[PDB]
Structure formats: structure tokens, C-alpha cells
Design a protein around this ligand. Structure first.
Ligand SMILES: [Mg+2]
Ligand SMILES: [Mg+2]
Ligand SMILES: [Mg+2]
Ligand SMILES: [Mg+2]
Ligand SMILES: [Mg+2]
Ligand SMILES: [Mg+2]
Ligand SMILES: [Mg+2]
Ligand SMILES: [Mg+2]
Ligand SMILES: [Mg+2]
Ligand SMILES: [Mg+2]
Ligand SMILES: [Mg+2]
Ligand SMILES: [Mg+2]
Ligand SMILES: [Mg+2]
Ligand SMILES: [Mg+2]
Ligand SMILES: [Mg+2]
Ligand SMILES: [Mg+2]
Ligand SMILES: [Zn+2]
Lengths: 102, 219, 96, 220, 59, 129, 130, 25, 87
RNA sequence: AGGGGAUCGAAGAUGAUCAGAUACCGUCGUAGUCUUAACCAUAAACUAUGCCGACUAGGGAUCGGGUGGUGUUUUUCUUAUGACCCACUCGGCACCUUACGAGAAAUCAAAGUCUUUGGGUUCUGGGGGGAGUAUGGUCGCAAGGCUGAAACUUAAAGGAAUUG
RNA sequence: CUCUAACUAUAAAAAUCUCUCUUCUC
């Protein structure tokens, strides 16, 4: 039976979209079904912020960030903890998991 | 029909305006309510206060027709209109239900809180949906203080007013109790303002009750 | 409204649609193809005589463990050979 | 036998005081009945018949925990029926609670005439129908003395109703007795849900019995 | 059930009966009848609830 | 494409009755709809309707009073011999004591009882009860 | 793993709600009170009951807590509830006997056939971006 | 079995039968 | 409904919804019957004398119970211009 | 068939894992992938929901267009645009709530207006397997496509959901 | 009754299983 009225794809009116490859397993998966996670992080983590600050010319050098949109597979997404199985009445909710920190 | 003594007296309309009953309905609207009038450019629809007062007097007429006082049961789950309900049940011989309304309080006959009334008054349909469903299951009228955004399912005569301010709910309960008492005849004539005060039905935060006690115990 | 036409002048397609659908049944298909006369051991025949060729017993299925006493008979009307069942308890010896 | 029946409902209190005389007052104002003793008081001669006892099992880690579903039909053969369906551990308790529910769920029916009216109504008033699960039951009026043309369970339901002549037609998996009896119950209770030309004039809305006699309730 | 009814009629705060054996069937089975509440742990099991075991011979 | 306009009218009536309303707006408003609603008025299953001239096939506003429970067209207007009238009444109407198979005769659009009184029969239009 | 199951908690709650004036802060005095005013069968349960009663008494002394209630606390709540300010919070006692309304509710007052002291002010229909 | 592989085995049987017929056509 | 002698044989004539003219089922456990007290000259609710409106469960579930009661009370001279017949 | 020939990669070549591994992991790797002509006509070609038409219920948003605002920033002194804001409307992919309707239910705002059965119309199915097989046509260079049974066998196969 | 900030980062191997199923009626 229909486990998902949206069929998971989130297409509803296109017929075909261009597939994208998985970052981990390189699975040719449609760009809308594939789970996209925007990893924006610090090029140097808090483990070395003090060290870099002390040992860098250009006082108050604003260190750069690194941005990458990761196109996960879906088997990979289940396995790499990116996305989790949910209750059948909980699958309804599409809002992200409530702002991890404020 | 009703004698012209039951028209919107100037002081009562002044009180209704002061408590900001009209000022806020919603930035949205549901077509179950043609109680709206002149949607304000601030996107906050105005409520026709005359219609609200007509609804109030109609609800008072419905309540006064009940032969035995304590089959009028008044519900309030949300904080803003808790105290007022209690105060209402103090003056009119009604039965209050404040805070949590235990489910099965109308259908289940084995609960020690099982009340079988002939009328239910609800401070907000969206918050007291459980009371409304319970009234549905046992053929009970629901006089709900509906706003221009609250749902009107299983809701009989609906006083249109505000639900996002304590002033509006407190004064609405005041007017309802006052007109019920006038209809019954305990209050002799319906012109004197019934000296007790609208602020008696207003909400009281525990923080401000502590502050008031501290100001009272300073001397 | 429904799949079938409804107009007052649509008798033709209704009739031919029913006539094409009737082949979906098994009884109607057997009756019209007349497979009973051509293929079955008897052509529309309730009974038929035959000659006993040999005297066999056939094992039953899983849930039932026994050997039912049968008999191979060649039909005389056309020459086909079919196995048949000797019904009752001590009737196998009766038929030689 | 031993029966006190302290009334816990205002309707029960009024009935015990003897203030409601006929069950028509209960049915008219759509009053909610929660005490089976009210129905016992109003209809002294409610016969029954256990339509079916069905073993229903739940698969737990240890064995199969089995209960019994009783399908009881209660009525007086004079235009009053009720259909209780209960599940319980012991079969006798299942039947007791089933008749108990059936008495709680009594309902009135509108017997009519197939053709011209000569004596008391012998059949239903109009065609009616109900549907529970996939079972849809269609009750159709029949001429006088035509019997009850229905399956044995539905036939017993009509006999408990008082309908003497009626045609029936059932579609679906009418095998399942609870679904068939529930569909027939829906139809026969829908018989009073059909507006008919002889039922067009408006009435005066006589005040509710618990409004005029509210004082005798509310045990003080 | 008559025994349980009589016992609870006597003023007991709970009765229970286990009938185990070949109840109208070749396979063994145990029927449990109870009413009230029966405790099971602590000498309340000795102070209040009293038990009795018997064998009955049938054909 | 609107094929049977009377079907649309009666479907709108049924939808606006089941929801409990007291009015319907039927758009195309032919003769046959007018005669159908006039018969319903004569027998009371309808209230006080109204024709709104458009110069464009007109429209109709129908007032109800909840007395009706179902209209409905027999979309293929079957030729109904005077012998088959009882057959249609049995198959369509819920009881013999009431209900009316509205059918179109050479003497106009009439309820089945009136047609049987004139001893004339024609094609069948619909049914009301 | 000391959690003080149903019996001790309910018994201590009833003890407080029926005997608050007699209860004290001290464990031993409340233990003797538990002996005299309640028939606890054993003595370990008596000690647990007195201990939780003392804990609940200390919590009450710190302030008002949910669940339990008694005559003194309910009377104080009712007295605080009966508070009504002699000064008026309505009828334009503030803002120099002037209420601020926009045009629309002013037309409401006008069309109602009533003459109230108003003060028109546009509501600047431009909405905040939030 | 999957319908896919039953179909493929049928196709291979048709392969053998087609080459046999072609050799003897 | 009526026997040829003219004696009633119906068990009871059911009430009908005062807003939609639809009958009220015996087990329609959502329908309500509102009572509105008559008012004399000085605003004293005369006891035991009132006007009753039977609202069906259907309109209540739909969400039009209050609107129907508004119109019905306006028709019988209870509320002044609370309901406009033209939306 | 002609052109190209980077990547990735049916076959193949191996190196591993294993009891076996000519499978999954790895490294190379033809045909193919990319194209100009000519074929092929099949996909879980799926919304597993035929098309046209009417009506039925509340809530927001979104895309294209159009109306009005004594609206806001825009700047070219003012204005005209544009871009927003508010209200409305038409059309589209959609979505949330609910049953007062429908369903065996999962669920559907259509899968509603269906035993209270008829708006027009096309195609398809009649238990499972044999079987989308054989045969006979027909299309194709080939692959294969379209059409498409029976003999016989079987009491089930299957759908949704509940507890383990 | 006014509000968009923090974060990473695991995939070795594991094939198969001979019984037998039993009534709910006050
Ligand atoms: Mg699955
Ligand atoms: Mg997804
Ligand atoms: Mg499209
Ligand atoms: Mg214990
Ligand atoms: Mg222990
Ligand atoms: Mg090439
Ligand atoms: Mg290889
Ligand atoms: Mg190898
Ligand atoms: Mg590889
Ligand atoms: Mg490579
Ligand atoms: Mg295909
Ligand atoms: Mg398909
Ligand atoms: Mg088949
Ligand atoms: Mg197949
Ligand atoms: Mg061929
Ligand atoms: Mg399944
Ligand atoms: Zn992947």
C-alpha cells in the first residue's frame, strides 16, 4: 500500500528529474528524492581556534567557513544516521527537528 | 420583543470598547462569522460590538430559562479566563470547571466529577474542544465565547469577542452574569451598574498576586 | 457516469460488449467452444462403459495417508484410457 | 430477584420516580440512555435471542488468549429493537453484557403499509437500507402476509421487531453475522429517519421531560 | 461459581477456585474462577488467605 | 460538455439539499427544468423558485423547505408504455403511497399519477419523492 | 533506589491536608504524631510516612506546592482572589479620560447611535516585517 | 524466481527453438 | 400513519430540526433543543414561559448552528438586526 | 552504417572474500555511453487513479495574468515604470484540517454527489497456475513488439489491517 | 510585547533446519 502519499520523491507534476550521485556510495538517485544536507562549518574547529588566533599574522583575521551541499543516497542516509525511521503518525511532520539550538 | 431598556447603554458600550473587545479579532477570518465590520487597515478586523451585546443578552435569555441554576456549567481551560468563571459561578448559581476539564466528565457516569448539566458555557472552542465533544455526545447546548478565528463546530449561540486579552474575557463574563442576574430578578433594576467591579473577573498572575500581597503587608 | 454507454441508440455496442465479455466465464466458454465433445473423455456423457486394463492403487495427498484402490479403464465408446475409482471398502476384489 | 437500582443518571432518577411513563418520551427528545434498568422499567417484556457466539483470539507470546463475542438481539415484537455485541472472557458473562448493551441500545421503528391501510401496520413504511463493513442490507415493503423474506438472522431480527411482512436483499460478505445484523439494524432504525408526506406538518416542540421535571432529578 | 458466590456471600474479601484436569476433553486444561482480590506475597498470604487442595475421582 | 441539463439541475438540487441549504442556483434553465420544478411545486417537494433572465438561456434560483429528499433524472429518456409505468414506480419510488415518476407525455410534462389519470404515457424524465 | 511508593506519598498527603496545624518541622515530633493520629500497621512504614511528611512540610514552608491543599492555604488563596482594586482600571480613569481608537471603530461607535469620547488615530497600515 | 528472469529463460528457450527452425527452414 | 378508521398507529411523531426541517432521529446524540426565556416589560424573565428551537445534530456538526439560531431568533423578534438575509 | 573516442563502464582480464565466488569490495577494460541518417515501440512509460461536464468544506500559502488601492520604499527635481505591501479574481503544480460523505480498510476534497442505484463516452477484468506459453496472423534486418487459447492441475492464490 | 548562528567524524565474515495443531456451551 502507499506508505507515502508523496511517494517520497516530492515531484508532483514533472514526470522526470535529473538524477544526482550519492556522496558516500555514488547511487544515481533523483535530485528530489535524494536527501540534501547543507554542511556549513568552520574551516578550523574550536579545537584549534585559540592556537590559530595566537599563531596568525593579520590580527583579527576573520577565518573563513567551508560550505558543501551533500547529496546523500537514501540507504546511506538511513545507515549514516542522517535520517531516521519515524512513527507512522510522525511521518506527517515535515518541519526540521525544531531548531537544534537557539 | 425586548423592551428598549435592553439596548446598548452608553456606559456598557464604553466598557466593551475599553476592554479592547472589538480591537482584536484576527489577521485572518473564517466565513462562519459575519460578525466582522470594517476590516482595519492594520489587518486586525474589528468586531461589531452591538452584535456582541445582542449575543450576550440572547445567551442571558437562554441561561435564565433554565429552571434549576446549577445545570449551567461553565468551562475554562486556558488561564486568562479561569478566575472569571469561578467568580461567575459565585454570583449566578452555576457550576464551574477551571483548569483541566477531565475527559469523560459528561459521558462517563462513574467519574466523581460526572456533571450532567442542561447547558455548557465555554471560554474558547479551540482550547476546550474536549468539553465541546463531550457536550456533543450527550445533547448539550454550547454557549461559547468564540472569536472571529475560533472554530464553530458543535457550537450553539456564540458571543463574538476577543480571546487574546484578559480584559475582554473578564468583562464579557461580567456582562453575562450581570444580565443573567437582572433576568432572574435578584438585581432589582437594570440601570444601576451593580457596584461590584469588572476587575473582579480579570486574570491575576501569581507574580502580581505576590506583589499585591507584598504591597499589602508593607504596613 | 459508468464505463458502459447509456444512450437510447447504443444497443449495438452494449450487446457486442456483453457478447465479448461472456467469454471470460468458464461455463459459457466450454458450452460454446464445445470442448466437452472434443477433449473430455466423454462427450457430454454422464456415464460410459469401458474395459478394465489393469488394477492399480493410488496414494493420497499430504494431509491424508492411505492408498485409494483405483482401476485403469479403456473406454469402449472412443478408446480413451482413464483411471477410475472403486468406491467402497471391499469392492476392489469384486471387479476383476 | 434482588435489585435496588440506585439511579445515577437524571433520566434514571426520573424513570425511578415514575415521572416518565412511556419510552416514546425518551425516543422523542433524543435522550441519552445509560442505565439498562430504564429500558427494563419501560418495556417489561423485552425478549431476546443469542444470534451467535464467536471465539476471537489474540496472539500473545504465550499461547493464544481467547475471548468470546456474543451477538444478542433484544426486542418486544411491537416496534422496539436493540442489537448488543459484546466480547468477554466467559461465554455467560459475554451474553449477559451483550443483552445489557442491547437493552441500552433499544431503538424505535416505523412500521407502515404496503398498499391500502386496513388494520395495524404489517410492513415497513418505505424502502430502507444500511451498510456495515461491506454488508449492505436493503429492506423493501411487502404485501400482507408475505412473511419475512430474509436470512435466518435478519428474519429473527424482524420477528423481534414486530415487522411481520418484509422483503430483503443483502449484498457483500453477509457471511459475517455481526456486520449483517448491524446493517439490518441501521436500516430498521433508519425507517424513522425518512421524511414522508404524512410526516410533513410541524409540531409545537413539547418541552423536554427533564426540563419540566428537573426538580425530581438532582438527588439532594 | 456457586461456591465462589456462597463464599463471597459469607463476607470474604475474595475467593478463587482452580479446577484442573480433563474437563470434558482428553487434553488437560485448567479453569480459573475468581472474584474479589487475592494477594500472593508476604505472610498476608499466611495471615489472611487460606487454601485447600483436593483430588476428585471421575470415570 | 453539458449533455443533459436537467441532470445538472437535479444534481445541484440534491447537493444543496443534502447539505441542508434552502436555495440553489441552476445555471442553464431550459423549459424542461421549469416544468420539472413546477410539478415539484404542485406536489410541494419544492418551495418558491425564480427565473432570472440573462438573454443567455437564463438562470433559476430555487427555494427549498427541506421537504424534498431526492430528485434524479433517468438520463436515457426511455419510451415508457402505459404498462411499464408501474414497473418504473416499483423500481424507483420507495413506497406506493407517495413519490412521483415525472414523465413527459404528448400532453406535457406530468407526474406519473396524473399521466395514468389521463390514460396517456410517453417518455420518462425523472423521479421525485 | 529510594522512591517512596504510592502508599507513603498518599498517606503523607492526606496527613498534611487533614492535620497541617499540628504538624511540625521536626521528624521525631511528626513521628509521634503519625503514631497517635494514624494507625500505621508496621513501624518501618510509619517511619517512611513521617519522613515524607516532614519533607512535604519543608517544601510547603519554602512555598506553595501543587497537589496538596489545606484549610489555611485555601483560605489564603480565596482572600487573595477576593482582591478588587478600589481605583478603576477602566472607564478612562487613565489617559486623561481619553481612549485611543482608529477610524473604523469610531464609525462603529457612530453607526451604533452612541456618542462616546473618542480619539481618532490612523493605524499605519504598513505592517512590521517581524 | 522473478518475472524478469522467467521471461529471460523463456527468451533463451525461444533462442534455441528459433535457431533450430532456421537451420531446418 | 393513519389507520382507515382514522386512529393513529405511529409510535410517535418525531421532532424536526427547526432550521432545516429535517426530522430528529431517536438516537441522534448530537442534536439540541434551545430554550429562550420570554421577557416582560421590566426585564424579568417570566418563569415557565419560553420559546424552544430544536437544532439538528447535522448543522451543529457542520458548523452552522449559531448562524441558524441567529436567523431563527431574529425572525421571531428576539435579536435586532443580528442576521442579514443577504450576505 | 559514417563521425568522433574524455569520463564511466555489459562482456572480458585479473587482485581479494569465501567451503566454493568466473557475485558484491578493487584495478584495467572492448561494445555502449556522445552524435548524423535509418530502425526499434517496449518501462514500476506510476498519480499503479481515462477523458469532457456540473455541484458539494473550511485554511493558508505558491506560479502566470488582470483589476483596485489617497499604501511602502525606491529617484530622474515630482511623477512613469519596476520592486514590494493589502484586497479581489481567473487558470496551474500542489498542500493542511475535518467527516458531515465514500471505502474491506491503508486512505480519498476526490477514490464524494452509488441499493435514495441512470450527465456523455472509450478501454479493460471474471479464482490461482499453465501463460502473456503454443499455434495462426501481422510488424521488424535482428532483437522482439501487437493479437493471443486450450488440454491439464488446483482450494485457494491475493488485498488492507490487528496482536505476537 | 520586537528576533536567522553553530558545527563534523563507524560500513570485515555468518550457509542450512525432519514431525504436530487439538470442543466452546449459561
Ligand atoms: Mg512495504
Ligand atoms: Mg524524501
Ligand atoms: Mg503539467
Ligand atoms: Mg500487593
Ligand atoms: Mg514483596
Ligand atoms: Mg559506430
Ligand atoms: Mg567479473
Ligand atoms: Mg576471482
Ligand atoms: Mg566491479
Ligand atoms: Mg576505469
Ligand atoms: Mg506494458
Ligand atoms: Mg498501467
Ligand atoms: Mg483466471
Ligand atoms: Mg499472469
Ligand atoms: Mg508468431
Ligand atoms: Mg499483506
Ligand atoms: Zn548512498
Amino acid at each position: 500500500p502507499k506508505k507515502r502519499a508523496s511517494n517520497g520523491r516530492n515531484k508532483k507534476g514533472r514526470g522526470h528529474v535529473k538524477p544526482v550521485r550519492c556522496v558516500n556510495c555514488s547511487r544515481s538517485v533523483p535530485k528530489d528524492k535524494a536527501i540534501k544536507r547543507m554542511a556549513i562549518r568552520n574551516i578550523v574547529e574550536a579545537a584549534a581556534i585559540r592556537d590559530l588566533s595566537e599563531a596568525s599574522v593579520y590580527a583579527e583575521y576573520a577565518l573563513p567557513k567551508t560550505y558543501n551541499k551533500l547529496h546523500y543516497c537514501i540507504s546511506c542516509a538511513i545507515h549514516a544516521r542522517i535520517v531516521r525511521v519515524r512513527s507512522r503518525t510522525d511521518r506527517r511532520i515535515r518541519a526540521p527537528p525544531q531548531r537544534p539550538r537557539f | 420583543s425586548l423592551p428598549s431598556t435592553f439596548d446598548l447603554t452608553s456606559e456598557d458600550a464604553q466598557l466593551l470598547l475599553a476592554a479592547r473587545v472589538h480591537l482584536g479579532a484576527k489577521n485572518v477570518q473564517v466565513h462562519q462569522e459575519p460578525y466582522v465590520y470594517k476590516a482595519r487597515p492594520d489587518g486586525v478586523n474589528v468586531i461589531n460590538v452591538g452584535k456582541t451585546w445582542e449575543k450576550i443578552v440572547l445567551a442571558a435569555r437562554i441561561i435564565a430559562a433554565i429552571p434549576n441554576p446549577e445545570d449551567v456549567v461553565a468551562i475554562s481551560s486556558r488561564t486568562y479566563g479561569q478566575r472569571a468563571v469561578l467568580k461567575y459561578a459565585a454570583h449566578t448559581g452555576a457550576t464551574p470547571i477551571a483548569g483541566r476539564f477531565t475527559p469523560g466528565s459528561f459521558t462517563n457516569y462513574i467519574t466523581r466529577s460526572f456533571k450532567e448539566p442542561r447547558l455548557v458555557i465555554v471560554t474558547d472552542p479551540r482550547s476546550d474542544a474536549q468539553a465541546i465533544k463531550e457536550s456533543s455526545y450527550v445533547n448539550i447546548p454550547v454557549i461559547a465565547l468564540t472569536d472571529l478565528d475560533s472554530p464553530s463546530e458543535y457550537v450553539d449561540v456564540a458571543i463574538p469577542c476577543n480571546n487574546r486579552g484578559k480584559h475582554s474575557i473578564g468583562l464579557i463574563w461580567y456582562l453575562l452574569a450581570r444580565e443573567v442576574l437582572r433576568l432572574r430578578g435578584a438585581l432589582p433594576d437594570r440601570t444601576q451598574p451593580w457596584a461590584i467591579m469588572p476587575d473582579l473577573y480579570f486574570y491575576r498572575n501569581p507574580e502580581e498576586i505576590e506583589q499585591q500581597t507584598a504591597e499589602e503587608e508593607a504596613v | 457516469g459508468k464505463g458502459k454507454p447509456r444512450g437510447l441508440n447504443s444497443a449495438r455496442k452494449l450487446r457486442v460488449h456483453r457478447r465479448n465479455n461472456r467469454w471470460a466465464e468458464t461455463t459459457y466458454k466450454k458450452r460454446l467452444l464445445g470442448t466437452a465433445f472434443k477433449s473430455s473423455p466423454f462427450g457430454g456423457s454422464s456415464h460410459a462403459k469401458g474395459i478394465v486394463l489393469e488394477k492399480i492403487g493410488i496414494e493420497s495427498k499430504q494431509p491424508n495417508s492411505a492408498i485409494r484402490k483405483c482401476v485403469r479403464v479403456q473406454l469402449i465408446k472412443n478408446g480413451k484410457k482413464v483411471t477410475a475409482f472403486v468406491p467402497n471398502d471391499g469392492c476392489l476384489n469384486f471387479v476383476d | 430477584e434482588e435489585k435496588g437500582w440506585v439511579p445515577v443518571t437524571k433520566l434514571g432518577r426520573l424513570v425511578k420516580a415514575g415521572k416518565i411513563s412511556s419510552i416514546e418520551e425518551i425516543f422523542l427528545h433524543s435522550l441519552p440512555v445509560k442505565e439498562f434498568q430504564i429500558i427494563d422499567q419501560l418495556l417489561p417484556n423485552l425478549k431476546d435471542e443469542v444470534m451467535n457466539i464467536k471465539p476471537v483470539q489474540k496472539q500473545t507470546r504465550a499461547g493464544q488468549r481467547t475471548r468470546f463475542k456474543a451477538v444478542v438481539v433484544v426486542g418486544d415484537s411491537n416496534g422496539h429493537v436493540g442489537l448488543g455485541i459484546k466480547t468477554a472472557k466467559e461465554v455467560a458473562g459475554a451474553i449477559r453484557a451483550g443483552i445489557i448493551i442491547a437493552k441500552l441500545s433499544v431503538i424505535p421503528i416505523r412500521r407502515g403499509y404496503w398498499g391500502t391501510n386496513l388494520g395495524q401496520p404489517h410492513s415497513l413504511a418505505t424502502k430502507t437500507s444500511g451498510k456495515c463493513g461491506s454488508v449492505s442490507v436493503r429492506l423493501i415493503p411487502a404485501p400482507r402476509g408475505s412473511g419475512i423474506v430474509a436470512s435466518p438472522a435478519v428474519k429473527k431480527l424482524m420477528q423481534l421487531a414486530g415487522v411481520e411482512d418484509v422483503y430483503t436483499s443483502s449484498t457483500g460478505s453477509t457471511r459475517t453475522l455481526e456486520n449483517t445484523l448491524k446493517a439490518a439494524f441501521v436500516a430498521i432504525g433508519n425507517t424513522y429517519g425518512f421524511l414522508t408526506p404524512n410526516l410533513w406538518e410541524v409540531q409545537a416542540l413539547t418541552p423536554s421531560p427533564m426540563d419540566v421535571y428537573a426538580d425530581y432529578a438532582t438527588a439532594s | 461459581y456457586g461456591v465462589v458466590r456462597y463464599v463471597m456471600e459469607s463476607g470474604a474479601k475474595g475467593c478463587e477456585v482452580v479446577i484442573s484436569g480433563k474437563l470434558r476433553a482428553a487434553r488437560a486444561k485448567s479453569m480459573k474462577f475468581a472474584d474479589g482480590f487475592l494477594i500472593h506475597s508476604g505472610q498476608p498470604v499466611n495471615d489472611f488467605i487460606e487454601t485447600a487442595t483436593r483430588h476428585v475421582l471421575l470415570r | 460538455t453539458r449533455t443533459s441539463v436537467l441532470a445538472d439541475a437535479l444534481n445541484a438540487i440534491n447537493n444543496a439539499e443534502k447539505t441542508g441549504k434552502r436555495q440553489v442556483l441552476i445555471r442553464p434553465s431550459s423549459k424542461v427544468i421549469i416544468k420539472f420544478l413546477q410539478v415539484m411545486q404542485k406536489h410541494g417537494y419544492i418551495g418558491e423558485f425564480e427565473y432570472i433572465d440573462d438573454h443567455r438561456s437564463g438562470k433559476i434560483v430555487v427555494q427549498l423547505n427541506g421537504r424534498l429528499n431526492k430528485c434524479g433524472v433517468i438520463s436515457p429518456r426511455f419510451n415508457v408504455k402505459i404498462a411499464d409505468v408501474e414497473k418504473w414506480t416499483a423500481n424507483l419510488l420507495p413506497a406506493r403511497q407517495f413519490g412521483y415518476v415525472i414523465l413527459t407525455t404528448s400532453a406535457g410534462i406530468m407526474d406519473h399519477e396524473e399521466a395514468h389519470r389521463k390514460h396517456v404515457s410517453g417518455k420518462i424524465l425523472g423521479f421525485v419523492y | 533506589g529510594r522512591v517512596r511508593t504510592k502508599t507513603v506519598k498518599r498517606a503523607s498527603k492526606a496527613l498534611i491536608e487533614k492535620y497541617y496545624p499540628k504538624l511540625t518541622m521536626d521528624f521525631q515530633t511528626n513521628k509521634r504524631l503519625c503514631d497517635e493520629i494514624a494507625t500505621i500497621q508496621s513501624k518501618r512504614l510509619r517511619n517512611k510516612i513521617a519522613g515524607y511528611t516532614t519533607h512535604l512540610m519543608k517544601r510547603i514552608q519554602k512555598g506553595p506546592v501543587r497537589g496538596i491543599s489545606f484549610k489555611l492555604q485555601e483560605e489564603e488563596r480565596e482572600r487573595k482572589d477576593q482582591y478588587v482594586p478600589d481605583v478603576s482600571a477602566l472607564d478612562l480613569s487613565h489617559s486623561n479620560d481619553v481612549l485611543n481608537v482608529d477610524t473604523q471603530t469610531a464609525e462603529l461607535v457612530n453607526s451604533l447611535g452612541l456618542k462616546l469620547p473618542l480619539s481618532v488615530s490612523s493605524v499605519s497600515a504598513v505592517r512590521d516585517r517581524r | 524466481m522473478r518475472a524478469k528472469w522467467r521471461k529471460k529463460r523463456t527468451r533463451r528457450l525461444k533462442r534455441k527453438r528459433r535457431k533450430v527452425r532456421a537451420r531446418s527452414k | 400513519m393513519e389507520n382507515d378508521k382514522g386512529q393513529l398507529v405511529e409510535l410517535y411523531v418525531p421532532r424536526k430540526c427547526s432550521a432545516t426541517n429535517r426530522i430528529i432521529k431517536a438516537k441522534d446524540h448530537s442534536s439540541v433543543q434551545i430554550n429562550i426565556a420570554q421577557v416582560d416589560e421590566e426585564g424579568r424573565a417570566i418563569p415557565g414561559e419560553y420559546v424552544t428551537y430544536a437544532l439538528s445534530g447535522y448543522i451543529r456538526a457542520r458548523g452552522e448552528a449559531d448562524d441558524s439560531l441567529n436567523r431563527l431568533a431574529q425572525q421571531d423578534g428576539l435579536l435586532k438586526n443580528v442576521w442579514s438575509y443577504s450576505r
